[PDB]
Amino acid sequence: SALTQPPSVSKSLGQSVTISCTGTSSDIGAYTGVSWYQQHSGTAPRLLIYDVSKRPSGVSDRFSGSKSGNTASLTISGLQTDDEADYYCCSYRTGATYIFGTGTRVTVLGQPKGAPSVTLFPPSSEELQANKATLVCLISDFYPGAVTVAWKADSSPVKAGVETTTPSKQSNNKYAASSYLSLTPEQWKSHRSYSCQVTHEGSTVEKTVAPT
Amino acid sequence: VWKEAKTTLFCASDAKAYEREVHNVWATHACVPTDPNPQEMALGNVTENFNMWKNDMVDQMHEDIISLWDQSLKPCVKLTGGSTVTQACPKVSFDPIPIHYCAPAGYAILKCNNETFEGTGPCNNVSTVQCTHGIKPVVSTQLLLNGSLAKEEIVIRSENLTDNAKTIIVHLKESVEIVCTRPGDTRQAHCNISEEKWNKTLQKVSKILQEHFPNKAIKFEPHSGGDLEITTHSFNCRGEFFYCNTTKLFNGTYNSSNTTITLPCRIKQIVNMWQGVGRAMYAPPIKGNITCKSIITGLLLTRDKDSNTETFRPGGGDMRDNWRSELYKYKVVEIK
Amino acid sequence: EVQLVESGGGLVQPGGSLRLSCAASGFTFSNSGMIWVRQAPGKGLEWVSYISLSGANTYYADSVKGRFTISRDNSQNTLSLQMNSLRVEDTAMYYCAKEGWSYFDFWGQGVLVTVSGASTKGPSVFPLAPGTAALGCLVKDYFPEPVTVSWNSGALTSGVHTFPAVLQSSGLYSLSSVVTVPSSSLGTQTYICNVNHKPSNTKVDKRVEP
Known part of the structure; x- marks a missing residue:
C-alpha cells in the first residue's frame, strides 16, 4: 500500500547520489504525475521535481528525475552541505488518491x-x-x-x-x-x-x- | 508555393431541379453541379506549416449556413433585446446533402494527407486539389454526425490543453449507428444505441487520452449548467428540433438481444439561436413515425477545470468547431 | 509573494473536536486545488484530504474517512478542516498546501494537533541568571508541544537559540531557550522572554536579571 524507498543513503561532497522509489502498476507504472520533495528537519517541505523530470523556478539544476516500468528515481549531482535532509516521492493512484514514499535520509559525509x-x-x-x-x-x-x-x-x-x-x-x-x-x-x-x-x-x- | 490569403469562396453540390425541400433548393441557385472528375496533384518532397483553427474558409461556410437557415426554415416567432417578429411558418420537407467548396482563379486548395496529423505545425506528405470531398452540414451539439471519419487511428484535435478553455474535439475510426424515433405525450421523444459499440469506443478513447495528457484515470461526466442546447444533444431531423438527455452516456471510468441504452428525448417548439443571442418559435409537429438513421463521426468536449482527476465533459455552443472536423486537412494558397 | 497562514492548533481530548483554518494570499484561491497533509512526530508524511477549486470533488484517505471534513470558502479565500472522533494516532504536525497540477508548490508553516487526555499542564517558567554572556528561560513541565519563545516581544532575534524539548519519564516536556549578549548591557537592558503555551492559555512574561 506504500511507496518503497531506501531508509538512508550516504555519499561525499561533489559526488552524485541515487534514490530509488518503488510502487505498483496502479500508480507509478501508469502515471507521470510524479513529484519529488525536500524536507529539512522541522521546516515546511519544498517542491523539487514534478511530472517525472520537470523543474519549477527556484530549484537548482543539480537535481534530476526519471521513470522506468514500476520505479521512480531521483539524482542529485554536485552534493553540498545544504542537501543534508529527508526526501520523499509522490504519486497519483487509480481512484483520484495520492500516496507518499517512506523517506530517505541523505547524509553528506566529510x-x-x-x-x-x-x-x-x-x-x-x-x-x-x-x-x-x-x-x-x-x-x-x-x-x-x-x-x-x-x-x-x-x-x-x-x-x-x-x-x-x-x-x-x-x-x-x-x-x-x-x-x-x-x-x-x-x-x-x-x-x-x-x-x-x-x-x-x-x-x-x-x-x-x-x-x- | 506557400502564400496564404483572403478570397470569397463558392459552393458545389448535386442539387436536384424537381425538388421542393430546403437544402438543394438553396443549392440550385447558390452554386453548381459536381464535376464527376475531381483530380489530385501530389507534391513530392514538400512539407509545410499550418494552424488549424484560424481560418476564413470556416467563416465563409459558417456565414453560408446562416444565410441558408434564416430564409428557408422560417419560424412562427423571433425575439432578442428590444425586438420581436412573427411570419408564416409552414412545415417543410428536409435532409442533409454533401457539399464541396471550390477555388477561384489564380489560386487553388491543398490536401494534408497526413492521416497522423493533429493540427499544429507541419504537414509531411501533401497534394493539391480543385475541391474538397462531399460534406453534409451537421447542426448538432456535443456529438458530430454523418461527417468525415478517421482512416488509420482515432486522433484528437484541440488548440492546446494548456489553454483548457479551448474546446477539445474528437473524430473516430469506426461509426456508431443511431436511430431516433417519435411515434404517431406527443412531445416526449427517445433515442437508441446498442451498448457494445459505445462502451468500446470510449475505452479506445480513454486509451488515447492517457497518452495525450501524460499520466491519469479517465473519468466521464455530463454538462454542469447554462442553457439547453449545449447541456443536451440538440439537433434537426427533417422538420423539428430534438433535445435529448445525455446523462447516461458519460459514465465514469471505462476499463480494459444485444442490449440497448435508451435516452429520454423531447422536442421543443422553443430553441436558443445558434447564430447569435436569441430565442425562437417554430411550427408544431406533423403526425406519424419520425425517424432518421444517421452515424456519429466525432465529438466535442471541454477539459473540466476542476479536480486532480480526469473529468471530461461535453462541449458545443459554437458551430465553427462543428465545421472544423471535416474541412481540417484542406487549405488556402496562391500560385505565385 | 504567496502565503499560507494556519491557525486552530492545540490540544484536544480523545473523542473531542477541533477545526483547522488555512488563510491564503498572493494568488487566485479559486483555479487551484488544495490539500491537507499531516506528519506524526518522527514519522513519514501522509496525505489527508483533497478538495477541488470549485469544490464538489472531495477525496479522502481510509484511516480518516468519515471523521474528517474538507471545505473551502472561495470568497474569504480560506480552507477549512473539521475533525471529529480524534484518536492519539492522529497527533501530527498539520500542513495546508497549494496544488499546481498533480504537484504541490508552496506550504503552510505547520500547526501541531496533539490528541491527548492529560488536563493540559501549563508550564512553569524560571529565570536563568547569567564581552559575551549567556542567559535564558527554563520552560519546565508542560504538556503538550509546542511552546513558542520570543525575546522582548520579538525585539531580540540575534543570539537566541531555542532547544528541542526533552521527553521526561513522567510524560512531560521541558525545553530551555538561551541567548548570547554583550557584557556591558547587563546594567541597562532588561531581558523578557515571551512563552506562549497555546493549548493551556498560558501566556507568561518573565524578567531575567543578574
Whole structure:
C-alpha cells in the first residue's frame, strides 16, 4: 500500500547520489504525475521535481528525475552541505488518491569537524523556592551527529536523574542536543560543585557550577 | 508555393431541379453541379506549416449556413433585446446533402494527407486539389454526425490543453449507428444505441487520452449548467428540433438481444439561436413515425477545470468547431 | 509573494473536536486545488484530504474517512478542516498546501494537533541568571508541544537559540531557550522572554536579571 524507498543513503561532497522509489502498476507504472520533495528537519517541505523530470523556478539544476516500468528515481549531482535532509516521492493512484514514499535520509559525509560549545546553568534561586532543582547542559556547534554525555558530582559518577535528547541538526548545519539532571534542592546545596562532561570523538569538555 | 490569403469562396453540390425541400433548393441557385472528375496533384518532397483553427474558409461556410437557415426554415416567432417578429411558418420537407467548396482563379486548395496529423505545425506528405470531398452540414451539439471519419487511428484535435478553455474535439475510426424515433405525450421523444459499440469506443478513447495528457484515470461526466442546447444533444431531423438527455452516456471510468441504452428525448417548439443571442418559435409537429438513421463521426468536449482527476465533459455552443472536423486537412494558397 | 497562514492548533481530548483554518494570499484561491497533509512526530508524511477549486470533488484517505471534513470558502479565500472522533494516532504536525497540477508548490508553516487526555499542564517558567554572556528561560513541565519563545516581544532575534524539548519519564516536556549578549548591557537592558503555551492559555512574561 506504500511507496518503497531506501531508509538512508550516504555519499561525499561533489559526488552524485541515487534514490530509488518503488510502487505498483496502479500508480507509478501508469502515471507521470510524479513529484519529488525536500524536507529539512522541522521546516515546511519544498517542491523539487514534478511530472517525472520537470523543474519549477527556484530549484537548482543539480537535481534530476526519471521513470522506468514500476520505479521512480531521483539524482542529485554536485552534493553540498545544504542537501543534508529527508526526501520523499509522490504519486497519483487509480481512484483520484495520492500516496507518499517512506523517506530517505541523505547524509553528506566529510564535513568539517566541529568542537562542542557547552553552557551549564545552575538551578535558579526561584526553582529552589519551589522545592525543585534542575541542571541544564546545552551542547551546540558540533559534527558529526554522535555524542556521549556523562555527569559528575564533585568527581564521582551519577547515573540517576538524567534525561538526554537525541542530537538534532540546527540552523548552521551543525548539531544540537540538551541534557537535563533532575535533583532535589538538598542534593544541589549539598555538593561543593557539580560537573557536566561531554564526549565527542576524543575531546572531553567540562563545566563546573558551585552553590553560592 | 506557400502564400496564404483572403478570397470569397463558392459552393458545389448535386442539387436536384424537381425538388421542393430546403437544402438543394438553396443549392440550385447558390452554386453548381459536381464535376464527376475531381483530380489530385501530389507534391513530392514538400512539407509545410499550418494552424488549424484560424481560418476564413470556416467563416465563409459558417456565414453560408446562416444565410441558408434564416430564409428557408422560417419560424412562427423571433425575439432578442428590444425586438420581436412573427411570419408564416409552414412545415417543410428536409435532409442533409454533401457539399464541396471550390477555388477561384489564380489560386487553388491543398490536401494534408497526413492521416497522423493533429493540427499544429507541419504537414509531411501533401497534394493539391480543385475541391474538397462531399460534406453534409451537421447542426448538432456535443456529438458530430454523418461527417468525415478517421482512416488509420482515432486522433484528437484541440488548440492546446494548456489553454483548457479551448474546446477539445474528437473524430473516430469506426461509426456508431443511431436511430431516433417519435411515434404517431406527443412531445416526449427517445433515442437508441446498442451498448457494445459505445462502451468500446470510449475505452479506445480513454486509451488515447492517457497518452495525450501524460499520466491519469479517465473519468466521464455530463454538462454542469447554462442553457439547453449545449447541456443536451440538440439537433434537426427533417422538420423539428430534438433535445435529448445525455446523462447516461458519460459514465465514469471505462476499463480494459444485444442490449440497448435508451435516452429520454423531447422536442421543443422553443430553441436558443445558434447564430447569435436569441430565442425562437417554430411550427408544431406533423403526425406519424419520425425517424432518421444517421452515424456519429466525432465529438466535442471541454477539459473540466476542476479536480486532480480526469473529468471530461461535453462541449458545443459554437458551430465553427462543428465545421472544423471535416474541412481540417484542406487549405488556402496562391500560385505565385 | 504567496502565503499560507494556519491557525486552530492545540490540544484536544480523545473523542473531542477541533477545526483547522488555512488563510491564503498572493494568488487566485479559486483555479487551484488544495490539500491537507499531516506528519506524526518522527514519522513519514501522509496525505489527508483533497478538495477541488470549485469544490464538489472531495477525496479522502481510509484511516480518516468519515471523521474528517474538507471545505473551502472561495470568497474569504480560506480552507477549512473539521475533525471529529480524534484518536492519539492522529497527533501530527498539520500542513495546508497549494496544488499546481498533480504537484504541490508552496506550504503552510505547520500547526501541531496533539490528541491527548492529560488536563493540559501549563508550564512553569524560571529565570536563568547569567564581552559575551549567556542567559535564558527554563520552560519546565508542560504538556503538550509546542511552546513558542520570543525575546522582548520579538525585539531580540540575534543570539537566541531555542532547544528541542526533552521527553521526561513522567510524560512531560521541558525545553530551555538561551541567548548570547554583550557584557556591558547587563546594567541597562532588561531581558523578557515571551512563552506562549497555546493549548493551556498560558501566556507568561518573565524578567531575567543578574
